[model samples]
Target: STGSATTTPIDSLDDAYITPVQIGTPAQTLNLDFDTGSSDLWVFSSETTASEVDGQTIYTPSKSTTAKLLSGATWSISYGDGSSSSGDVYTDTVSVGGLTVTGQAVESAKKVSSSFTEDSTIDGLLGLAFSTLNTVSPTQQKTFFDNAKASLDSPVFTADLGYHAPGTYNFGFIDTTAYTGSITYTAVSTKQGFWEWTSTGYAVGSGTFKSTSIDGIADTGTTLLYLPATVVSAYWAQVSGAKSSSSVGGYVFPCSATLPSFTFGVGSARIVIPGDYIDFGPISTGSSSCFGGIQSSAGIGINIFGDVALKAAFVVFNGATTPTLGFASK
Candidate 1:
């Protein structure tokens, strides 16, 4: 079978993170982050000599008889978090679940974070998220979905985070298991490495709210919902000011007060941001003084609507279906 491999059972907490990719004759597992901000597939390597490679799960090329190493040159990648890795590129016969592909490319990060380096339990990030920021050559940049789409019964994949846990993420053909509505297929404009989109409109407390129209490429890779000043101000107007300075990030408003409901138009779908999402942490200085649900991102051209927004909707990355994005509520 081209589906799940008959391998050792993974930990309960780790199960949701496992994604099956074709590996030679059978499917193999890899840890992935179901992110939408960027699109790519990366893994940890065994040959990486970084000091932090101690605990993180290193992809031992030797373990896989099918994995082929491209030894011509070494590769290095750096992130905003300052974590970087260097290692050799490889083209291996890999598979995911029942999907199969030949000569699939995978990256090996030789260096990583302290937590990633020491934790032998955790593996690498599977970037299924969408972004124009691809480090590899366009021809070589093949996301997990890029190769698997041909065999997937449906051209859709869904990620469910709330049901599993914070770290829990799932993916596969989306049968619209828990969703009640249809998805929105929006046109995507790429610029300067970020996926940008204009919010058709916004709503607050059953009424239309006014704000800037431009927003940026969003992916599950981020953890926070960043907004423009105009949008943040429009949202804040509906709620009372809870803080004195702008030093504190995000919209920090009163938590106990009657909060307003908000939604943004993404493509054709109207993604809702519940009032609870606006409930940020309260300031220690004044228990009544709470952190805002929205925040101020004045100059950032690209705004990422992190986990907060993605949870409300079931997103699909259809690189195989169309050049534009295929979005739907989960």
Candidate 2:
């Protein structure tokens, strides 16, 4: 079977996307962040303490007859942004789009970090990464895609993230109509529990594409495109008034700067990110200072091709075989 769903940007152009997901028998519809960077299908639940649950909706497994606790199982996860969530586990029916996975392990959050508690719109996270990365203790949990793959026409998913607009997430099949030009494929390294790949090189604006191979992960959950410190510095240098600011925790520039487009090599394809998209809105309200959408992957220790770079192209996350990535212009 094949399925597809619409994803809406959480805010502006460089944030995460949210999709509708049904959990439990009665079909509790929750807006979950479809993250490819992590593996763990967890949700805010009745198990969550009142102080931990903010204005977000909660999933009550007791209300569903199909819900069963996975004895002695628990989960805890932390994001690069310092957000985290932890909880016990329950087996129930979890559906995304039109595809449903019965007896799926759904982690029930008993505690959530301040980052998650404040994001009232996101009720939970639907991890799209490999099952090996699942955080469940005693036994790891399988993602919705992993459980539903054998039943799908093809083990594949496509992400078409838009700029300040709604996008589509296609499962089981690739819609050729959604992307122009041929898709250039690249082998992925799942060693780090991510869809990681090495870029042949990148170019700042219309500059020459350097031959610097950079290892990075294609993370849908991350908002900015991260590269090596040297690479980041080179790109920011081209923009007038651009400078690293500890106050903002990244490179920020005047809003009036005429930013140049950035490009990266994936296989033989050169995916270009527009200059305007690189301007990650304003650093603060009522100010002309704007933060860059591309930054150095310092503390993270790994480059991230986040929404800023992913949105610039149509990406195919193929779960079959070695797990490859295909890129094409939108």
The C-alpha TM-scores of every prediction are 0.74, 0.98
List CA RMSD, all candidates: 5.2, 1.1
The lDDT for every candidate, in the order shown, is 0.56, 0.90
Off by over 4 Å in 1: 1-28, 80-83, 114-122, 129-132, 137-139, 163-173, 190-196, 237-241, 244-259, 267-269, 279-293
Q: How close is candidate 2 to the true structure, as a TM-score?
A: 0.98
In model 1, where is the ten-residue run with the lowest total lDDT?
A: 7-16
TM-score of 1: 0.74
Tens-place lDDT per residue, model 2, 69-171, is 9999999999889888998999999888888889999999999998898888899999988889999999988988899899999999989998989998888
Best by lDDT: 2
Which residue pairs show backbone clashes in model 2? none
After superposition, the stretches of candidate 2 with alpha carbons farther than 4 Å from their true spots are none
